[PDB]
Amino acid sequence: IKEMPQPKTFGELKNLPLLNTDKPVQALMKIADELGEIFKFEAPGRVTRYLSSQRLIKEACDESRFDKNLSQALKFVRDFAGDGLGTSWTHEKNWKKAHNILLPSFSQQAMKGYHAMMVDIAVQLVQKWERLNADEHIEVPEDMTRLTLDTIGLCGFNYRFNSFYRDQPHPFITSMVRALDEVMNKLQRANPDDPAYDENKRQFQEDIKVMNDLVDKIIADRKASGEQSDDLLTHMLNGKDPETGEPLDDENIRYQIITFLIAGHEVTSGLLSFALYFLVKNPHVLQKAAEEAARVLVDPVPSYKQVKQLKYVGMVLNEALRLWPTVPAFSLYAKEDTVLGGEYPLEKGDELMVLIPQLHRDKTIWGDDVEEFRPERFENPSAIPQHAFKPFGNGQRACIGQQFALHEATLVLGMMLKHFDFEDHTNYELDIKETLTLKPEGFVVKAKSKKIPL
Numbered sequence: 001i002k003e004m005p006q007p008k009t010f011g012e013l014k015n016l017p018l019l020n021t022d023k024p025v026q027a028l029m030k031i032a033d034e035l036g037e038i039f040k041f042e043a044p045g046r047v048t049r050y051l052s053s054q055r056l057i058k059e060a061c062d063e064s065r066f067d068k069n070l071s072q073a074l075k076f077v078r079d080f081a082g083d084g085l086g087t088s089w090t091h092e093k094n095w096k097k098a099h100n101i102l103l104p105s106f107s108q109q110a111m112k113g114y115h116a117m118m119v120d121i122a123v124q125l126v127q128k129w130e131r132l133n134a135d136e137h138i139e140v141p142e143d144m145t146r147l148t149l150d151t152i153g154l155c156g157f158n159y160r161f162n163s164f165y166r167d168q169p170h171p172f173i174t175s176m177v178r179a180l181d182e183v184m185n186k187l188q189r190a191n192p193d194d195p196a197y198d199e200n201k202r203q204f205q206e207d208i209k210v211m212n213d214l215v216d217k218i219i220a221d222r223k224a225s226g227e228q229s230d231d232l233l234t235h236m237l238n239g240k241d242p243e244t245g246e247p248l249d250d251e252n253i254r255y256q257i258i259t260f261l262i263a264g265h266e267v268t269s270g271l272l273s274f275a276l277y278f279l280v281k282n283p284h285v286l287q288k289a290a291e292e293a294a295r296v297l298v299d300p301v302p303s304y305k306q307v308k309q310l311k312y313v314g315m316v317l318n319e320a321l322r323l324w325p326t327v328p329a330f331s332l333y334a335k336e337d338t339v340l341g342g343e344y345p346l347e348k349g350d351e352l353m354v355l356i357p358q359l360h361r362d363k364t365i366w367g368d369d370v371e372e373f374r375p376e377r378f379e380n381p382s383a384i385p386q387h388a389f390k391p392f393g394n395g396q397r398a399c400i401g402q403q404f405a406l407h408e409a410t411l412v413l414g415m416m417l418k419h420f421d422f423e424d425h426t427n428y429e430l431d432i433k434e435t436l437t438l439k440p441e442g443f444v445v446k447a448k449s450k451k452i453p454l
């Protein structure tokens with residue numbers, strides 16, 4: 001029996017003030033560096049344990065011993081994502097129902113049907129960059145978010161956000177981002193009941209109403225038109241859970257749409273942003289990825305099959321997910337009393353946090369060059385030990401969107417590498433801005449067209 005370490009405390013507030021910082025994930029990584037593979041973390045009314053080693057996390061990923069927990073972040077997101085798939089407990093009827101209904105909509109096979117709509121947006125991104133003047137640069141996260149948001153709007157409910165036509169965000173996105181911002185602020189409040197936050201709370205209630213009203217209208221409009229487009233909304237309106245034989249109701253459909261819009265916004269564009277960052281910081285890797293793009297993408301527009309042949313691009317994306325996974329943690333609870341790692345006894349209901357970026361730096365798994373960007377680490381998933389790489393979560397509660405995210409990311413990065421040479425013209429210094437996701441803030445490049453037509 002080992003006593004786990006714990007970072008510095010602040011009297012009655014326990015460890016909570018350590019989260020009152022601009023970059024809490026990066027702060028928690030630094031604590032893990034200092035304290036090792038497990039540390040206790042306490043706040044008023046809260047005890048959890050942060051795990052960072054594959055040795056312990058492989059046990060935590062045992063679904064017979066641990067189930068998904070809603071972290072405080074997820075509990076707060078649930079105020080607007082409801083019992084959508086990402087904020088529901090495994091035992092809620094709507095989790096298994098929606099899971100069973102949506103699985104075929106998200107399979108590798110379903111990507112063949114989304115492919116054309118993803119290409120539509122990817123070409124818009126390429127045309128924007130083809131149309132820049134010589135003296136201009138690219139705001140990378142900003143453009144990647146235009147791409148990923150538009151892609152989930154079109155594939156998700158046949159709706160064009162038309163993000164490449166505008167600077168101001170869509171009304172829905174204004175409220176979604178402000179809601180997510182309130183969540184992060186609320187996690188950092190030492191005195192969350194202070195009347196100083198009454199306005200924040202009033203604003204949050206307003207932003208929830210905007211998200212609900214706008215998505216409910218999307219659903220109502222679709223029902224009234226009878227249109228049967230090949231999108232997630234159509235699948236949810238028509239699908240029946242094989243098990244219960246029931247369809248999802250409209251309220252839960254709205255929560256799923258809200259869930260997908262969160263996931264497909266900065267969470268997914270973060271992957272592309274970090275990938276392009278690592279590529280321009282590693283020119284030999286960029287060249288190898290660019291050589292593959294040119295070899296495989298022989299037609300004016302990529303086909304579904306060509307995207308699947310972009311193996312090295314897929315390895316680039318996995319290595320980007322290894323260093324900066326854009327859902328940086330998830331939470332579990334013990335289903336019964338159990339012992340973690342032969343050393344840490346846990347009681348039924350005890351909570352764990354999996355600190356993914358720190359797992360992905362476990363030198364006993366990856367070797368001493370863990371900070372280097374080497375996509376070749378992913379040549380053979382069979383050489384990687386169990387549960388060493390978890391950017392999409394675990395088990396039946398893993399990311400249902402994983403194939404969607406990787407297909408759109410591989411497609412557009414492939415096209416970017418085919419059509420442009422890239423210059424890190426400012427010698428950009430990585431600055432990772434934290435929301436509930438991660439972004440290389442202010443990352444900019446210049447792109448010189450290879451003048452290959454579409």
Ligand code: HEM
Nearest residue numbers: 085086260263268271327330391392393397399400401405
């Ligand atoms: C690179 C982009 C993405 C990453 C890194 C990511 C990561 C994750 C992770 C780690 C989880 C587990 C969370 C937990 O255990 O609390 C998760 C769950 C989920 N993700 Fe993603 N995701 C991405 C993109 C997407 C997209 C594009 C969609 C949908 C369009 C999506 C939909 C979901 C859903 C619905 C769940 C909940 C699944 C369930 O519990 O049944 N994700 N994601």
Ligand SMILES: O=C(CCCCCn1ccnc1)N[C@@H](Cc1ccccc1)C(=O)O
Nearest residue numbers: 043046071072073074187327328329436437
């Ligand atoms: O460590 C984290 C990282 C954030 C996890 C959410 C990530 N994500 C984003 C979208 N979907 C999930 N979050 C803990 C913080 C905490 C610990 C103890 C006491 C208070 C807060 C939590 O949210 O509970």
